[PDB]
């Protein structure tokens, strides 16, 4: 059932061909649906009144197939243009587009072929095993407010560290990890800790 879309596209086209074939058996108001019954039984003056019912019916029944195949082809073309867009952005690159290249943060994708379709094996970094930390938007030092260059400030409870947003890895807060702007009085929720100068 993981293949469900490709098998559905096979089944719809097989069901449409079978329905178009079965419609040859329908009478449409002629004396028989087997055309050679009409042509053997009726003279070619009476017979045209009967055969034109089968032509009217079978023509309408072919247009009903072709119209649905044109609409179904547009639905497959919309999927092929999406698959070509996934091939370009997701296999040939790496995507910033959330949930485009599978759930998680996208790393890379490997294309595999399948009957009437394509299958992408999207490789994604999913973050796991959280810890809760106390946090602050900035650090006061010499009245200067310091903000993080990369990542966020966090505390284990006793000490203040800076760390990257998506993987806990604590670093001592320094003038290399942080940049100054303005002074302590301006920022809601700023906290006091020493900022180390290497």
């Amino acid at each position: 059932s993981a293949l469900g879309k490709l098998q559905d596209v096979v089944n719809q086209n097989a069901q449409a061909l079978n329905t178009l074939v079965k419609q040859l058996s329908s009478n449409f108001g002629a004396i028989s649906s087997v055309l050679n019954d009409i042509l053997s039984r009726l003279d070619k003056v009476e017979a045209e009144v009967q055969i034109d019912r089968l032509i009217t019916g079978r023509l309408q029944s072919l247009q009903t197939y072709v119209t649905q195949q044109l609409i179904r082809a547009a639905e497959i073309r919309a999927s092929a243009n999406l698959a070509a867009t996934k091939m370009s952005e997701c296999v040939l690159g790496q995507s910033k587009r959330v949930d485009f290249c599978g759930k998680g943060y996208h790393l890379m994708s490997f294309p595999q072929s399948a009957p009437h379709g394509v299958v992408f094996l999207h490789v994604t970094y999913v973050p796991a095993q959280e810890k809760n930390f106390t946090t602050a938007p900035a650090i006061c030092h010499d009245g200067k407010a310091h903000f993080p260059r990369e990542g966020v400030f966090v505390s284990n409870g006793t000490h203040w560290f800076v760390t990257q947003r998506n993987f806990y890895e604590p670093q001592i807060i320094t003038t290399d990890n942080t940049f100054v702007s303005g002074n302590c009085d301006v920022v809601i929720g700023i906290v006091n800790n020493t900022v180390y100068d290497p």
């Binding site: 032509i55 599978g102 970094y125 796991a128």
Partner: protein, 384 residues
Amino acid sequence: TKCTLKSFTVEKGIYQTSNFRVQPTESIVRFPNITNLCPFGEVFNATRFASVYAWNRKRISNCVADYSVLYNSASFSTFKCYGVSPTKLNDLCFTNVYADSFVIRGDEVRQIAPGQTGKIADYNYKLPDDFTGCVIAWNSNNLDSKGNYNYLYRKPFERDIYFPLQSYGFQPTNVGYQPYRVVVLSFELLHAPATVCGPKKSTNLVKNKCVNFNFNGLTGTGVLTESNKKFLPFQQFGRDIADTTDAVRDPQTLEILDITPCSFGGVSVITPGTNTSNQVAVLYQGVNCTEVNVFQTRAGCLIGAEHVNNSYECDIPIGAGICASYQTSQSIIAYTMSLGAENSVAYSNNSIAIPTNFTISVTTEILPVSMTKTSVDCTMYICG
């Protein structure tokens, strides 16, 4: 379900197989309660008939007639009917009927036909292109063939009282050269009070129960009730957008009956796979359970599935937040679908959660790209 799918195996799902309809218990027949017998003997056995330029016109009204008495008579050389069949006339009725009466040559009977070509047809007696009624005629060579030289000829239904005067010559020695008397019965199917009707007796009226009614010829299946429809004194019927009659004045008690088609709806059959169980549940769409282990959903009355107080992922979707599944000793159950586990995020103005680890996930995504390249020889398909 197996006959809807044309299959002996059915997958887990819901299938729109059939339509539930309450059936008519009895047939209810209503006509004007009037008992005079129509003057058709005065029309068909008269001593003299008019010339075809002049043609008299009886109006028949306020009376009852049997048309089968005319249709089974050996007297008539034709009985051709248009917009009604002569077998049906006794089951059906009309606001007015008219009988046009006159004498013609037998070579000209086919000029008394709707829209047909001819000298009598254009100058003095065109039947409308959209006629409804019957042409009845007989050779009158026993009465009009004295010879006799009197009967005279030159928009539809218009009388026309060198010379504009030409007349036939009828001798009893003359088949197409003989005189014929022709009667044309024209029937006034207005959406108005009937006054000329077939011999068929009316029943008593029935209400709230489903019936196969007939009012004045308006055959139809439906529940009849009294109504809030304040008809004005001249109104006989009401209609829906689909032209179908939607109320009627009763032709005897003169009250304003509602018509509602008897309680009906689509049937969906809810099933696990036959590859698992032959037990099934049924949804009667869009109906209260009162006309149909029974559970009113907002989609319809659901029968044969147990209502379960829990919530789960939607296995077979029914509609309006309800789903069904086959579960534990096992049966079909119906439940309000779960949207997901419920989670208060531990937010506060100074708390952050940072992941200490990761999992590399690989997710398969499947996309169609190209369907089968069918191609069809439309000449061989249509013509073999």
